[PDB]
Amino acid sequence: MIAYHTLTKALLFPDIDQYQHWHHVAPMLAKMLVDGKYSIHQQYEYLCLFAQLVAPVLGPYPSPGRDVYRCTLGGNMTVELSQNFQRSGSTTRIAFEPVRYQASVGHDRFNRTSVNAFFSQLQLLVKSVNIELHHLLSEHLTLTAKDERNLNEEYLTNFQVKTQYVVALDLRKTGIVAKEYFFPGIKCAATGQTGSNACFGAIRAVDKDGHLDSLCQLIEAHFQQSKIDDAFLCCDLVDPAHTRFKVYIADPLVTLARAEEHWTLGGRLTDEDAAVGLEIIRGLWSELGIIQGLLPIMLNYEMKAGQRLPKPKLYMPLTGIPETKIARIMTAFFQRHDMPEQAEVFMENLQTRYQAWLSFAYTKEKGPYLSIYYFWP
Numbered sequence: 478m479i480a481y482h483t484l485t486k487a488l489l490f491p492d493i494d495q496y497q498h499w500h501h502v503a504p505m506l507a508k509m510l511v512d513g514k515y516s517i518h519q520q521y522e523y524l525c526l527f528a529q530l531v532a533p534v535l536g537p538y539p540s541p542g543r544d545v546y547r548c549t550l551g552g553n554m555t556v557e558l559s560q561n562f563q564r565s566g567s568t569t570r571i572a573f574e575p576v577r578y579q580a581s582v583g584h585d586r587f588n589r590t591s592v593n594a595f596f597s598q599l600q601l602l603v604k605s606v607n608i609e610l611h612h613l614l615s616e617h618l619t620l621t622a623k624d625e626r627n628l629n630e631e632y633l634t635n636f637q638v639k640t641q642y643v644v645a646l647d648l649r650k651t652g653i654v655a656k657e658y659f660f661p662g663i664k665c666a667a668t669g670q671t672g673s674n675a676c677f678g679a680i681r682a683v684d685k686d687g688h689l690d691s692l693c694q695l696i697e698a699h700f701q702q703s704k705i706d707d708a709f710l711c712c713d714l715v716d717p718a719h720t721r722f723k724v725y726i727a728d729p730l731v732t733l734a735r736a737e738e739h740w741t742l743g744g745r746l747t748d749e750d751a752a753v754g755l756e757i758i759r760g761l762w763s764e765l766g767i768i769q770g771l772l773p774i775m776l777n778y779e780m781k782a783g784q785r786l787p788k789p790k791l792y793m794p795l796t797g798i799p800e801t802k803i804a805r806i807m808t809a810f811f812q813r814h815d816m817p818e819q820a821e822v823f824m825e826n827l828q829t830r831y832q833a834w835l836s837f838a839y840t841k842e843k844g845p846y847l848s849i850y851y852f853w854p
């Protein structure tokens with residue numbers, strides 16, 4: 478927290494909205510950089526990079542009753558913070574929808590320009606960021622001008638917001654990596670397309686050599702057998718030949734049996750890593766006691782050029798679970814899986830935050846891969 482109080486004494490914020498976003502997000506971000514064992518230098522580097530690069534693209538501060546373009550990151554904000562736990566270490570991640578005030582006053586109805594503004598700044602501070610996939614995929618997964626012509630005023634009453642892009646800055650200790658989330662819900666409300674046809678069609682359009690055709694077919698076959706539609710997509714803002722594509726689903730059937738069905742793609746994933754992860758999920762689910770504005774379960778399946786099979790990850794809704802028990806269960810989990818550093822922090826804070834989701838992935842290369850997504854008060 479010292480790094481937040483320090484930069485507060487030295488940062489000049491151009492408007493009241495960047496100022497309010499800083500005193501809202503930076504204190505929690507400071508505590509997560511400390512808990513993640515970030516060197517004091519990278520604590521100042523990432524807090525200042527948040528104020529310089531991220532706070533301008535957060536739009537007007539969404540005070541109670543303010544008529545602004547809204548988002549649901551962290552439940553009610555344009556910015557959401559999550560922490561990742563694995564044996565190699567804890568890393569913080571910031572996720573946000575780039576937005577400028579014009580979207581709140583009728584000069585960018587579907588908020589298509591601010592992601593381009595933000596990328597033009599981000600690429601000046603992080604030279605490794607590559608936005609080629611943003612140019613290739615935006616046409617396939619967002620509302621184009623043509624789609625806007627064929628679109629009626631008759632998605633929002635069930636999904637609430639007009640969001641189509643979300644950027645995630647994974648604050649790795651070796652350097653930031655950026656990821657982009659495309660939400661084709663609005664594009665599909667105009668073309669009548671399904672989420673799967675949009676996302677899987679987008680991956681096949683980019684993968685012109687068909688490296689990922691085997692992996693999309695396996696996931697697609699499960700989706701129509703399970704009768705589930707793809708929700709959205711994600712990419713790594715890197716060279717398009719070395720990126721990881723992820724397809725997400727949300728399932729209002731929150732049962733362990735359903736999550737186990739999705740985790741294995743209906744039995745199509747039979748490798749050893751999926752079996753071990755399946756085992757750990759059953760324990761974690763039963764340990765936490767996931768209960769049956771109802772949050773569903775979510776999963777994504779990752780595709781890379783060299784990989785022969787997709788790789789699942791499950792998102793468990795931590796609603797209704799006492800925060801003391803998530804702490805009690807996570808501490809014991811890190812202890813029993815050789816993560817004494819993460820077990821130590823949770824043990825020290827077993828001694829005001831709101832944990833909303835716990836995600837799980839597994840390779841025995843890197844061990845258990847878990848993330849906690851927090852919501853703003």
Ligand SMILES: Cc1nccc2c1[nH]c1ccccc12
Nearest residue numbers: 557572643658775792834850
């Ligand atoms: C920032 C963001 N973008 C896309 C998807 C998700 C997200 N945060 C999440 C938390 C739990 C489950 C899914 C998501």
